[PDB]
């Protein structure tokens, strides 16, 4: 196999993209390095799948080996990494101050805002990892219903972060709090989207009353890239509902300017540039990555393989339901049009008013529809159905 060697001076990062066909294996052979906030272990082999875009950053200097065919591979001497460090350090200062005034202390809450392709997910991951490396357990909140690092597309989700992200796999799905939105864009149902992140905020505020570490750990909140029109109001409303102390704007000066004049005076507002290592995505890439996200939910990853079950379910044993006048509940009759659609197992025992704002156990995929036998084949993470109430999602997946 073809080998590439890289010498990284202090405060430099190796930016590489895996080829379209082949895996790239990374090894740190000298010094200290990190990938999006997670420390790399010396001489450990990290295998990245095809089309992976990765930055390995070093604070003090590193030598890194790459094995395999790369699409691109170069060392960048200029990064916004110290900015993220200073943001983290400022949050930890707020923690210390509030801990010394409680005799429980509530952790600082940060809102990340900006358009698509600015590295918002990457920055959230770094900030969470740094909090973990400080000894904290932050709550990571994902409001982006298009691309979700916690659950499937069409979800508003949150996880308690107790360990640094796996270099390849990201953060562990340690009992996630997931709400089903059922659309890739908030513009499909604006009143429901607002209701869901307000419910998320209310849920978490009550959860942290039972957990001191989660409370002081604070919140890092990722938004969708919709900054124009009604999307701007969602940002202001998310900031209010989550009672954020800090708003970080990535690469959008007009949004920064507008938020500085509307947000309460106590809210610290920081504009940061996007990393030069962020590549812009097209519609095809996002659609492919959404499909890859669904596939990861059921089947897992290379390192952590999940084994989903494929079993038949009678329509008499389940209740199919759809949301959408906008927040109105609709009972679904078994049809051919439910094929390839995702369905959420609601935590509500009855298909009624409670379904709208209830979290979900998880998701299944309807693969086959047997209208003659009155059964449907579903791909499900567990052996039996966790709920009899199945909530419709407009997200389709071909498997
Ligand atoms: N400094 C960097 N060097 C190299 N690659 C990077 C860097 N930062 C981010 N990337 C890569 O760019 C891609 C997009 O990053 P990320 O998902 O954080 O952007 P985003 O704006 O949150 O995405 P979206 O546009 O879907 O909202 C990812 O594959 C990530 O690995
Ligand atoms: Mn993102």
Swiss-Prot record:
- Key word Nucleotide-binding present: yes
Entry's Gene Ontology BP terms:
mRNA 3'-end processing; tRNA splicing, via endonucleolytic cleavage and ligation
* Keywords associated with the record: ATP-binding, mRNA processing, Nucleotide-binding, Nucleus
The record's GO molecular-function terms, alphabetically, read:
ATP binding; ATP-dependent polyribonucleotide 5'-hydroxyl-kinase activity; polynucleotide 5'-hydroxyl-kinase activity
Subcellular location field: Nucleus
Record's Pfam families?
Answer: Clp1 (PF06807), CLP1_N (PF16573), CLP1_P (PF16575)
UniProt main location, coarse: nucleus
Q: Which InterPro entries match?
A: Clp1 (IPR028606), Clp1/Grc3 (IPR045116), Clp1_C (IPR010655), Clp1_C_sf (IPR038238), Clp1_N (IPR032324), Clp1_N_sf (IPR038239), CLP1_P (IPR032319), P-loop_NTPase (IPR027417)
Task: Give the GO cellular component terms, alphabetically.
Answer: mRNA cleavage factor complex; nucleus
UniProt: ATP binding residues: 13, 53, 117-122
Functionally, this protein is described as follows: Required for endonucleolytic cleavage during polyadenylation-dependent pre-mRNA 3'-end formation.
Q: Which family does it belong to?
A: Belongs to the Clp1 family. Clp1 subfamily.
What is this protein called in UniProt?
Protein clpf-1
Source species taxonomy: Eukaryota, Metazoa, Ecdysozoa, Nematoda, Chromadorea
Q: What gene makes this protein? A: clpf-1
